[PDB]
Amino acid sequence: TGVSAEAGEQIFWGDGQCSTCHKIGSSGSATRGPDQEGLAERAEERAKELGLSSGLEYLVESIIDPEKYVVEGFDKIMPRVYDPPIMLSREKILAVLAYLQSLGGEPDLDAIMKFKDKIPEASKTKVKPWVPPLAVTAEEGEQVFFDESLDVTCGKCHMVNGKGQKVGPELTGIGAIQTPQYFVESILEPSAVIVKGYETVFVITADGIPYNGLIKSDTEEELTLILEESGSVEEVVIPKDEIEDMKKQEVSIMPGNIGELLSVRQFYAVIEYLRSLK
Ligand code: HEC
Ligand code: HEC
Ligand SMILES: [Ca+2]
Ligand SMILES: [Ca+2]
Ligand SMILES: [Ca+2]
Ligand SMILES: [Ca+2]
Ligand SMILES: [Ca+2]
């Protein structure tokens, strides 16, 4: 579809998967990444701060090297879309760049095209295929995921296609977005990345009772937290009137000992399951 901003808009809201994480003002509802309304103008500001040549160069860097600069308030969750699974072609990334420049600015197609030699070609990805050291299947991993008899049951906290229970984020479709490496890190190092909105907060009530957990809901009169302990979850409803302090923290309520609770086989099975959630 070429390299125009109109083509980039279809890709951003389509095969580029950008809108599964990024909203744009009132269009879309995703929150894993920042709202991209006015991105073009704050790209100029980032480029100034980071000593880059132009806002566009910052936009390029944000795609080709998402880890190189991490927007305040977010963790290293953005994938390299020219790598699997997304495997976004080079012409499509050039189009997306044109769309990003349109978010509060004007696309500059000549200037975008000079960056073509910096955009990796998806077909030429260097990522090695994922081959687990054991034969496992996604179906086997689905069984593990929802197995209430185990010492950890992903389904107690995650929903997939209407099955499971909501504590952490819904995992439907994450296999089309994320890498096996991200699944490994998510399972064995759960606080390395905290999905936006699923932070733990420390609450102290006026009476001096502590509650530490994630926010399920937040009304004018009630704060409902989900607490975790030894793989179990429980809700507490805290009157807003009685809250003395509330501080966000960097621990995830996802258990930190899953490497002790899953076998090697179960672990690689679950990963095959996540990869399959397209
Ligand atoms: C969820 C897994 C995401 C995907 C899919 C996309 N993005 Fe993303 N992006 C995400 C986060 C959490 C952040 C902030 C952390 C960081 O890496 O800086 C970003 C950031 C950007 C930016 C910079 C925004 C800024 O305010 O400076 C850009 C320009 C950007 N992302 C572009 C972008 C594109 C074009 C995507 C589809 C090809 C895309 N992102 C997907 C999370 C996620
Ligand atoms: C409740 C006590 C949980 C259990 C049991 C499991 N997970 Fe979890 N997970 C939970 C939360 C609150 C979050 C968000 C905060 C964070 O740690 O990032 C997550 C996150 C994930 C992710 C990242 C999702 C994303 O959108 O990027 C993954 C891939 C994930 N969790 C996988 C996973 C697996 C495979 C589990 C069973 C072995 C599992 N989780 C259990 C809370 C809880
Ligand atoms: Ca970045
Ligand atoms: Ca995590
Ligand atoms: Ca009140
Ligand atoms: Ca706890
Ligand atoms: Ca209790």
Author numbering: 39 to 316
Extract from the study:
In our 1.75 Å resolution crystal structure, a glycerol molecule from the cryoprotectant binds in between the two hemes. We therefore collected data from a crystal cryoprotected in PEG 1000, which showed that without glycerol, the space between the two hemes is occupied by the side chain of Arg70, but that the structure was otherwise unchanged. As the data from this crystal were of lower quality, we performed all analyses using the 1.75 Å resolution data from the crystal cryoprotected with glycerol. Importantly, in our theoretical calculations of redox potentials (see later), the presence or absence of the glycerol or the Arg70 side chain between the heme groups did not affect the results by more than a few millivolts.
Kustd1711 is a putative electron transfer protein encoded on the nitrite oxidoreductase (nxr) gene cluster of anaerobic ammonium-oxidizing (anammox) bacteria and consists of two heme-containing domains and one additional domain. Here, we describe a diheme cytochrome c with high heme redox potentials of about +350 mV, despite having a large overall negative charge, which typically reduces redox potentials. High-resolution crystal structures, spectroelectrochemical measurements, and high-end computational methods show how this is achieved: each heme iron has a calcium cation positioned next to it at a distance of only 6.9 Å, raising their redox potentials by several hundred millivolts through electrostatic interaction. We suggest that this has evolved to provide the protein with a high redox potential despite its large negative surface charge, which it likely requires for interactions with redox partners.
